[PDB]
């Protein structure tokens, strides 16, 4: 029949906190909207982007959004207006 053997020691998990590109490459974007959530600086800010307390990327003056490259393997968010 059955014997009662446990247990599992590993069941727990955090709340899934979200990341990823909140806008695209070419979006009109209002002032102060979050471009890209980050744990750290996975991508750096350039023209008319600040950096949050969560080191997040958000655009100050409106216009298009371009994802770029520093050189050699390092990205960079800048916002160009109309």
């Amino acid at each position: 029949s059955k014997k009662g053997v446990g247990s599992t020691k590993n069941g727990r998990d955090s709340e899934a906190k979200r990341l990823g590109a909140k806008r695209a490459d070419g979006q009109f974007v209002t002032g102060g909207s979050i471009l890209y959530r980050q744990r750290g600086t996975k991508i750096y800010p350039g023209e008319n982007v600040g950096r949050g307390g969560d080191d997040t990327l958000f655009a100050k003056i409106d216009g298009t959004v371009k994802f770029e490259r520093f050189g050699r393997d390092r990205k960079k968010v800048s916002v160009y207006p109309v």
Binding site: K2, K3, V5, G6, S7, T8, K9
Partner: peptide, 10 residues
């Protein structure tokens, strides 16, 4: 898993 025991539980 040690034999003749149910599924699951680690």
């Amino acid at each position: 898993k040690p034999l003749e025991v149910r599924m699951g539980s680690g």
